Design a protein around this ligand. Sequence first.
Ligand SMILES: Nc1ncnc2c1ncn2[C@@H]1O[C@H](COP(=O)(O)OP(=O)(O)O)[C@@H](O)[C@H]1O
Ligand SMILES: Nc1ncnc2c1ncn2[C@@H]1O[C@H](COP(=O)(O)OP(=O)(O)O)[C@@H](O)[C@H]1O
Ligand SMILES: Nc1ncnc2c1ncn2[C@@H]1O[C@H](COP(=O)(O)OP(=O)(O)O)[C@@H](O)[C@H]1O
Lengths: 517, 516, 516
Amino acid sequence: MLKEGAKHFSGLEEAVYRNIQACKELAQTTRTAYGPNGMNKMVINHLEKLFVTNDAATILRELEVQHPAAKMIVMASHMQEQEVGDGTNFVLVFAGALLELAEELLRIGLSVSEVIEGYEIACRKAHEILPNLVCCSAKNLRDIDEVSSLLRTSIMSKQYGNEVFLAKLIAQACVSIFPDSGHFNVDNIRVCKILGSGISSSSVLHGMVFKKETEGDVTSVKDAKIAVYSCPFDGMITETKGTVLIKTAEELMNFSKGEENLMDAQVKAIADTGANVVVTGGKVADMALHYANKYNIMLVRLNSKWDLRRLCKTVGATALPRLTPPVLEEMGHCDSVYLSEVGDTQVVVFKHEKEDGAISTIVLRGSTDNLMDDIERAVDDGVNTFKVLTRDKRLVPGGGATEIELAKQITSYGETCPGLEQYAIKKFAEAFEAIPRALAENSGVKANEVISKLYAVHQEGNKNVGLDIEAEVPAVKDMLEAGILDTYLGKYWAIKLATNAAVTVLRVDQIIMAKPA
Amino acid sequence: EVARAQAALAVNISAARGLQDVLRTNLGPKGTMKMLVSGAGDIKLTKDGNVLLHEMQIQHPTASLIAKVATAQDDITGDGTTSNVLIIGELLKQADLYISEGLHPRIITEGFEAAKEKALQFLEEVKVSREMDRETLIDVARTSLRTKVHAELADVLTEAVVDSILAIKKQDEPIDLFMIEIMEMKHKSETDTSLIRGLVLDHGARHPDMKKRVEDAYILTCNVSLEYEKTEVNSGFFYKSAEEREKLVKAERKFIEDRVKKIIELKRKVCGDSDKGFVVINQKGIDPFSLDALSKEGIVALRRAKRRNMERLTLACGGVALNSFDDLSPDCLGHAGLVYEYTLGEEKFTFIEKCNNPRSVTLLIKGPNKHTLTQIKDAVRDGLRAVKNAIDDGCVVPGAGAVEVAMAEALIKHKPSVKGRAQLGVQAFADALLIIPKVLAQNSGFDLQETLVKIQAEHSESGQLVGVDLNTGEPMVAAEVGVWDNYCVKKQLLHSCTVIATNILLVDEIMRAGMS
Amino acid sequence: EVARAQAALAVNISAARGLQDVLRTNLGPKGTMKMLVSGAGDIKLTKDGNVLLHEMQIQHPTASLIAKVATAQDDITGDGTTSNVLIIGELLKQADLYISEGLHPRIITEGFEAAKEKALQFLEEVKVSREMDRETLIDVARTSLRTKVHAELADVLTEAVVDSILAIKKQDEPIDLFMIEIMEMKHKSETDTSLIRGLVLDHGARHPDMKKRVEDAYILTCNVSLEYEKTEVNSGFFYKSAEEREKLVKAERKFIEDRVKKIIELKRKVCGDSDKGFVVINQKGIDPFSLDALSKEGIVALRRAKRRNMERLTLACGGVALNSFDDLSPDCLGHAGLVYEYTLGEEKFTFIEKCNNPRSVTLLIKGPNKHTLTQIKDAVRDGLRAVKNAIDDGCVVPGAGAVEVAMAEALIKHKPSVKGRAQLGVQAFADALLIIPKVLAQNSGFDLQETLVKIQAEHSESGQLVGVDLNTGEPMVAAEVGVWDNYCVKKQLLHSCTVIATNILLVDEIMRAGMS
Ligand SMILES: Nc1ncnc2c1ncn2[C@@H]1O[C@H](COP(=O)(O)OP(=O)(O)O)[C@@H](O)[C@H]1O
Ligand SMILES: Nc1ncnc2c1ncn2[C@@H]1O[C@H](COP(=O)(O)OP(=O)(O)O)[C@@H](O)[C@H]1O
Ligand SMILES: Nc1ncnc2c1ncn2[C@@H]1O[C@H](COP(=O)(O)OP(=O)(O)O)[C@@H](O)[C@H]1O
């Protein structure tokens, strides 16, 4: 009319409407998950493979939204993902509940400043009262079952069928390096895929693990310096065709002898300079393997960009795809390279650990390539959850037993200070009842009776609804002796990010114009 | 082609009312922010007046011309582009109503000029002086930060601004805003500010871990070719023979060896110990084999330096930039007191302080890696501009809507002359000055007429400058809280409003012609 | 069916503004006349307010209801239906503007009531008395005629009106406008008026030229069958035999002969000369053979008399109406002093005067045989009503637009209380009272604001009641020229305006329902 060009429907009335409906429609395609349930969704983008996923991370990473209100939450989601391990749908659910509860306050007739102040006061009160429900704590991290229970509890959120063997494997792989005390890295654990048997035959192995065959000889010496290259066996001599049938044998024999002499001089110069082995990334030839066998030089076969990228980012060499024989400028720190036979396949093992910065690589195997993705996701999630950078994790009874207690505390605190700040406190307290409802609605029964039962027993804070049929209607179980706990700092960071996102959304809310060309 | 009516004034009044209604919810600290996105999906948050008026797509040519005229008069004072379109729109509406009633624009213009003169006289007679100290500047910077940024991080920036102003200003001549560099970084936190009393160098050295406690250091700026590249070159033209280029490379290597030997002997002559250090700034690369031999004796050489860095170094210290490494007079070597190396991110920074004549303060700010850092920079720039404007004069009048009420009371009651034709314009000019308190009370969340009549009764009973409270809506005095303003800003705003309202009512007809 | 908006007030304000703009050019003596024609091409000329509002076709129901309410309040005082829609429209426009600005109708109604009370108190305190004589009534009637008829024949009309008022009013009780009969005739000239001190008889006699200088005359009113028709009758039913009807006719003739002999002997007994005349009034016909024998002795008998004529004759003189011509007491015979016969047109008129208790004055007027005679009659009726209204009281305040200025000055300056909410309505009520002088100056042929500010400056300098001049546009005093007004008329107008403006803003929603 005066500013926009019939593109967006912004003005002095869309605030208490579209800015909330967009977030509601964005969050409605997410409440179907959140909990140990089988709600797989297929993802079709550019790979054209038709794969089903369960986590919301890969779902949000593929969906393209064209709205600022929906894009204001993916930033906080990525920030929470970069900060701690898990935690993604909680912030979205909290923001959606806060917006749905503030819509009524805005429709009644209240300013946004009072609502923002009340939300900030409620968030401060929740952050102050949070360090008070600490039950269990971490004792010694040098044991096995102490961390295995936490790993099983973290894996049970994703996979419900098999969760003991994977947790035990992750615990054995993490305890063989370094604990949380001192220094522990994350990018030192690799996951390899082996197409063979099922998942009931996995094992662990310390060091580098790569599925690369060997057509030469077993070189178990320490002077075998590595030498990575791009495509050394490509084509240094390009041969063309003269006639149609065949040419003279003299010229072909001369060219073959010249190429053989050139490659012999090349391998002699690359072996006499201080490099017994060579990493190739091209094709093979009969004379090539003949020279490799007669010169006692290990020759690989399988080539991959990820392998050379990892070798470059770990050692620190540089590939030299040149025709003329260069000089030795790829000296690294590896020396102990051994060969092993696993699953009738030749694998390499690197030994260079000096009791500092050790690496590990778990051996994974499955049926198809569409099943190891969930296993790798569970493994990396458990690895990220194991890292907490503190000796005492101060675990709290998660699953919804603390949300009701926090809501009751906020409700009891809000019924004291007078003024027009009680409505926002009551809304922030009532917004905490969105976790048990989504967990009860995604099972098979209703959620009102579950909430009434949880509010009718006692204010102990250790009661939550189970997963079996004998725990849906009563929902009276003690999760303290079962082993279901959550991260203390994770919930705090999630609540902080949700409050920040809600404040940012409620602040910037007027007219959305455009920019001139 | 032929048009003899009054539709031009009608469409002008309509466009003015539309422009006033579009921008009217950005007044006061409790305003609403705005967002702009169109080019490749770039989210940009803003709330200022000139920044919004400069980056918008207005479909009306009259509104675009009005915005251009308003922005063209913003380079005079600090920030006066806001709170201006409302009074102009009110005056234009009053003029249109008086024209529809039956009058001439000449009498309206004369009355507007008389009212402007009376308001100028009242502002000149009502001014008061105040001793400039530290609390006044602190309060001014706090009010500026509250009007710009939210009421959260507005406490850690005002102190740094006041400290930088006190460290820069120490003479009698007016200060200049060209010796303060505002840099930005990338961190994980939000509230992170620093006030460095020295210079900042982005680049450092390729071989760290040698020394960092260099007290009295000597810095020499040059631009010779120490080690640009190991590739063979000639004169910008490829040849065929390799003997000539290899001989040129050998000669260049011999020249580099001679230069490093000369600088080594110079460092050995001008020093000879470990306390007297030397630092060299060069824009070309540095070979590690020569860097090791240089550091073995106790002289650091930096590579990849920007032009602004060496410019600030030669302007703050005072050194001659030559193109030779010969043994010359040490008069061009600048002195450095303290050198520190900060390791963060993917590049180590260098901080030099305790030098001669500390006339270079750096306000380092950090953000959570987004677009709010530019907003914080604009806010601190507006705060520095307001502080500079509040330090040039010595008279500061209170604000918070306590000057327009007295002006209207003086223009309505104590009339300068007795004339109905002049009063017809005086009343219209006085009734258009009460839009600021009404808009403030509407945006604060209260009524519009109740607070107005309350302030009127409080001013009629007492007689002091009564302000507007944005908390309870009760009339209070703005002379005891801490709300202040400027002096020439109000005069410039009144002059701009009068100039805009004068050259608008004289529009006769608008024809459709022109080719260029 | 379902409606929750504010369009009802909008359409009400629109209808009020339309009704105010339709009727606004009929104020002051220099107003433009209108015309109405629809029924069989009947040209009607009028200029009054109630007469126009009662005979019009309005397409708006709200305007029709407003006109009906305004006409239903004209039976209290004389003429107060005019100069009322303008103030109501101005008040409604001010209320709509204040509602669009943001206010509640309750505060507006309270302020309007307070302003009405203040204006009533000011009018009660500003009133003044004056001795009623002849010049004051003459000036009042002259102004009333000038406000209706042109300034040509506004002399012989007011002189005759004052003469009739002085001849009728002579007691202490309030006079009644039921003893003055206004008749009309048909002549060739235009200005022709007469004031008869006696009664008027339209019919006379069939055989004229006998006598007309009859001093003392005795009049007797009856209703017997003297000579209705010569046709044979019976009892309202035709028969077949002629002997019965001829015998009935013979008996009727014998009865008529007996009656005429009885009245002849009665005239001979009660008189016997030629000075004392005997006039007889009968509604039936008179035979010429008997009329000649009657006139031979000196008794005149009239035929074809109306009921109102004999009613006025028996009410002014005092006679008993019997149905017999017997010899009874002469107490029922009325006395007449002078009888005259005027011969003009196709029927001779009779004028009887010099009777007992002259309480019957006739205002005869002649026109050029058109429709302006009704307009002259309405004008003289309005003048008589104004004279009667100016004779019941003893206090007359000046007019010519000199009461509204003082009222506005007292309502604006000397405020009864200090309250912004009440002032918001007081200012709106005071700004609507200046709609009379502005419209008067616009209709006179001058400016609107120049004369207004001139009158304002004159009233601020001097302080007396300054009127509006309809000749040169200069401010003059209306207390020395001759312009006067009433007392209760202004109070009734203010009450009606307040009642109309009060029960309008309380309209919520207008739904479409009903069946009756
Ligand atoms: N086996 C279980 N028993 C009880 N609660 C569980 C179980 N598994 C998951 N949960 C609950 O489901 C919630 C969501 O877990 P998860 O999906 O790992 O995090 P996010 O939803 O942030 O991705 C957690 O708060 C946890 O309390
Ligand atoms: N601390 C304060 N308390 C009340 N009102 C204030 C305060 N600071 C500024 N204002 C009001 O804000 C108005 C100007 O705000 P704005 O248009 O944002 O310009 P600026 O940012 O220069 O203040 C002034 O009219 C003043 O009355
Ligand atoms: N002689 C006069 N000189 C000036 N103004 C007059 C005169 N007589 C009447 N008026 C004006 O005419 C107005 C009323 O006229 P009108 O509406 O026709 O009613 P009316 O016929 O009762 O006077 C009054 O406001 C008065 O000011």
